[PDB]
Amino acid sequence: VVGGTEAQRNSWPSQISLQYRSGSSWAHTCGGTLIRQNWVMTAAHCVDRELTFRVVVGEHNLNQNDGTEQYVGVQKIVVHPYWNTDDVAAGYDIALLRLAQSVTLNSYVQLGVLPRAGTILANNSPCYITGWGLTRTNGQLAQTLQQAYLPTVDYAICSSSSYWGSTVKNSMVCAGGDGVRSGCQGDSGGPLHCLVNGQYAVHGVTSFVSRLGCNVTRKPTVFTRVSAYISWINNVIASN
Ligand code: NA
């Protein structure tokens, strides 16, 4: 997250860190949202590589013991069957991860609330992106979980020629684009939390930023629209 602030430890208890095994270590690669005690929602592109993945729930500082983490292996990966890694602009950038164990819920570990199917936010709706991604274009991962205020940019604006044009689809949510605050590499797969009738819900799964940079004016961060995928999500969990 570029232009973020450090999240309070218990603000976003559904955020997870998706990590891969790297030598004798683990490396953060993406975010995710805990949606059942044994299921995480992330971006399909995050699991393109044939790596050993683990999820960390209750994570705050990637580099320090928080005293709240639970570490769990990924047992099964179900990518949207329409995802094409050579075509992120087509959409379908969503995957579900079945965890090897069910995690224990507490003020640091909670299920993310998903929107009702078909919900579309009004332009300029209040949302926060969260994650440990780069804090500058071509920078480094954050140590502590970051949040940035990124209001939505509706489809009609976001798909206009000076924004993303044809690249954005109605199956996506755009947010931000102010040239200061944005998602960045390593935030992919995590949540966009939007405040609706008093409750935050996870409306987005972070998908992409511009090839030119993370915080680029009129290139808002682009997210998979969760409310387009409720039936898919429910079908995968029920059949797995
Ligand atoms: Na930690």
Which residue is it, tokens 């682009």? 222
Domain ranges of the chain: 1-12+112-227, 13-111+228-240
Q: What is the CB neighbour count within 10 angstroms for residue 57?
A: 26
Does the fold of domain 13-111+228-240 match that of domain 1-12+112-227?
yes
Q: Determination technique for this PDB entry?
A: X-ray
- Assigned CATH class of 1-12+112-227: mainly beta
How many angstroms does the Cα of residue 19 sit away from the middle of ligand 1? 13
Q: What homologous superfamily is domain 13-111+228-240 in, according to CATH? A: Trypsin-like serine proteases (2.40.10.10)
Q: Clarify whether 178 is annotated catalytic.
A: no
184 φ, ψ (degrees, to nearest 5): -150, 180
CA of residue 109 to ligand 1 center, whole Å = 13
Closest of 209, 199, 207, 198 to residue 226, by C-alpha: 207
- If we measure between CA atoms, which residue out of 73, 62, 18, 7 comes closest to residue 43? 18
Cα 91 from Cα 164, distance rounded (Å): 14
At residue 207, what are phi and psi to the nearest 5 degrees? -115, -55
- CB within 8 A of 213, min separation 6: which ones? 137, 219
Q: Which helix (H) or strand (E) holds 234?
A: helix 230-239
Percent of the chain that is helix, strand, coil (3-state, to 5): 10, 40, 50
d(CA 219, CA 112): 27
User: Resolution (in Å) of the shown entry?
Assistant: 1.1
Residue 60 annotated as catalytic: no
CB 101 within 8 A of CB 91: no
Residues pairing with 4 in the sheet: none
What 3-state class would DSSP assign to 59?
coil
From 14, 17, 80, 93, active-site residue = 93
Distance CA 226, CA 203 (A): 5
- Which conformational region is residue 211 in: left (phi greater than 0), alpha (psi within -120 to 50 degrees), or beta? alpha
188 labelled catalytic = yes
CA terminus-to-terminus distance, the chain:
33
CA 141, chain centre distance (Å): 15
6 is in an annotated binding site: no
